[PDB]
Amino acid sequence: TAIFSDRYKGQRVLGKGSFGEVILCKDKITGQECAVKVISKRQVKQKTDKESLLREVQLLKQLDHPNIMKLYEFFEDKGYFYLVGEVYTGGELFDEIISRKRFSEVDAARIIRQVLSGITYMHKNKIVHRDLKPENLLLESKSKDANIRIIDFGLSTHFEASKKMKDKIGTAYYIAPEVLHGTYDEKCDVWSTGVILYILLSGCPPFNGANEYDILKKVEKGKYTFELPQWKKVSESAKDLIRKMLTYVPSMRISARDALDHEWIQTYTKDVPSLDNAILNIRQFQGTQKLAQAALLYMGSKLTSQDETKELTAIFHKMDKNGDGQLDRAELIEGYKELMRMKGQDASMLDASAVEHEVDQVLDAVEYSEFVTVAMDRKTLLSRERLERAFRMFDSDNSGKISSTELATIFGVSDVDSETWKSVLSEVDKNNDGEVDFDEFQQMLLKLCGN
Numbered sequence: 001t002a003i004f005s006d007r008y009k010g011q012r013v014l015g016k017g018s019f020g021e022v023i024l025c026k027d028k029i030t031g032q033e034c035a036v037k038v039i040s041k042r043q044v045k046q047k048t049d050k051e052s053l054l055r056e057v058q059l060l061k062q063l064d065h066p067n068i069m070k071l072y073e074f075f076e077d078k079g080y081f082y083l084v085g086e087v088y089t090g091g092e093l094f095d096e097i098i099s100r101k102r103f104s105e106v107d108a109a110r111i112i113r114q115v116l117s118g119i120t121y122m123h124k125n126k127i128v129h130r131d132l133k134p135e136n137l138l139l140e141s142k143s144k145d146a147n148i149r150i151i152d153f154g155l156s157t158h159f160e161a162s163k164k165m166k167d168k169i170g171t172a173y174y175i176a177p178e179v180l181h182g183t184y185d186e187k188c189d190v191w192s193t194g195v196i197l198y199i200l201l202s203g204c205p206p207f208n209g210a211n212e213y214d215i216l217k218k219v220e221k222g223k224y225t226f227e228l229p230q231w232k233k234v235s236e237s238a239k240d241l242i243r244k245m246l247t248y249v250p251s252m253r254i255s256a257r258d259a260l261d262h263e264w265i266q267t268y269t270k271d272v273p274s275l276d277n278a279i280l281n282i283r284q285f286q287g288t289q290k291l292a293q294a295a296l297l298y299m300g301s302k303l304t305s306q307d308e309t310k311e312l313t314a315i316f317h318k319m320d321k322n323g324d325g326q327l328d329r330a331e332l333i334e335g336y337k338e339l340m341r342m343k344g345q346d347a348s349m350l351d352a353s354a355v356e357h358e359v360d361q362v363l364d365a366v367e368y369s370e371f372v373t374v375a376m377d378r379k380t381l382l383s384r385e386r387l388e389r390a391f392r393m394f395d396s397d398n399s400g401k402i403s404s405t406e407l408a409t410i411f412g413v414s415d416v417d418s419e420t421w422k423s424v425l426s427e428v429d430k431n432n433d434g435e436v437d438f439d440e441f442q443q444m445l446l447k448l449c450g451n
């Protein structure tokens with residue numbers, strides 16, 4: 001048994017992924033930068049025993065492929081699992097596709113050839129992804145010709161999926177029908193890739209709906225069509241591959257290996273017009289998915305900040321002996337560390353030295369009542385500006401407003417009941433204009449999480 005904090009130190013928060021938060025860490029001797037996924041044992045349950053998890057981790061470390069994330073180390077303590085691996089800076093595949101001006105079948109074929117090359121390799125080693133989606137397709141670096149890296153391969157076998165809607169955004173579109181009923185094998189990853197290929201060439205999911213349960217209903221039935229006008233500009237071989245990848249019965253569905261030898265992958269990687277209607281639809285889709293996620297994370301961060309404000313105020317009130325409302329530096333460190341000992345250690349706060357630094361950063365700006373307000377506003381600082389940034393990206397015409405039809409789509413992806421947000425809208429919008437600005441939209445989210 002080795003300790004994580006003795007080998008690695010936290011540098012900055014990279015983001016939130018499946019089963020936990022991702023941190024940019026650095027080796028205290030060699031100085032090698034690494035991405036670390038911190039899985040909380042309280043929030044995430046184990047689907048397998050300790051000996052099964054250690055055997056797969058050991059295998060996953062020895063595996064190597066240019067389109068699969070490299071895992072380096074694994075650590076464990078009383079309340080956490082630390083998966084240490086290679087860090088990628090190119091960002092998510094779909095976030096890059098919306099920034100580029102043109103996109104065609106040659107670009108889509110080059111993307112899916114890499115995804116299949118990685119999936120084929122991991123299938124030969126008896127490892128299944130299960131939760132493959134665009135969010136799990138990161139680009140290795142900030143370049144035009146950057147390789148794709150599939151992340152979280154094999155973690156679904158050992159960790160239970162979250163039931164919280166903030167952790168289930170954009171999952172129902174790509175999940176295979178057999179995974180919903182229980183009997184599934186490695187062919188579920190081909191379906192998930194088939195769905196991604198369908199969106200790359202049209203910009204609309206094949207199985208869609210006004211809410212999570214409606215999307216799963218269409219997926220379970222397994223029916224889709226190429227009746228949208230944008231499919232006329234796409235080739236017949238691209239559609240044939242999608243037909244074979246989105247076959248309902250997994251035994252009849254094409255394998256990852258045979259999908260590489262398909263005429264479409266062989267012809268478009270070894271005329272081709274730009275798919276302009278597809279890029280505009282991927283841009284709208286990505287913006288809608290990111291605003292829905294930012295809304296749920298904003299509502300979540302606000303709720304945790306209220307709980308932590310009252311808990312941190314109760315800790316400092318007990319420590320205040322004379323009752324003057326003031327405390328020393330060393331006292332404030334003991335109280336802030338006590339919050340992590342009671343309400344679970346923070347992802348950014350890797351050790352006691354990280355807490356001492358965070359307390360000093362609050363004291364530079366900032367009376368313990370004033371210290372709580374600043375310390376807790378810095379926790380939400382990322383989620384508040386991410387919501388505003390996501391609202392500005394969603395509002396592509398820069399009108400400053402979001403229509404009622406757009407709210408229904410946003411709240412639909414966030415799985416907020418139709419009658420609940422329409423009732424909350426009436427509490428702020430009393431003139432019924434059928435549209436809201438950012439402040440009004442933020443006020444709706446605050447009312448939805450008890451404010």
Ligand SMILES: CC(C)(C)n1nc(Sc2cccc(Cl)c2)c2c(N)ncnc21
Binds near residue numbers: 037089
């Ligand atoms: C985009 C996001 C912040 C979510 N992210 N996700 C990953 S997944 C990962 C990161 C660390 C450990 C394991 Cl098991 C998987 C990851 C990584 N490698 N490098 C940079 N960022 C990463």
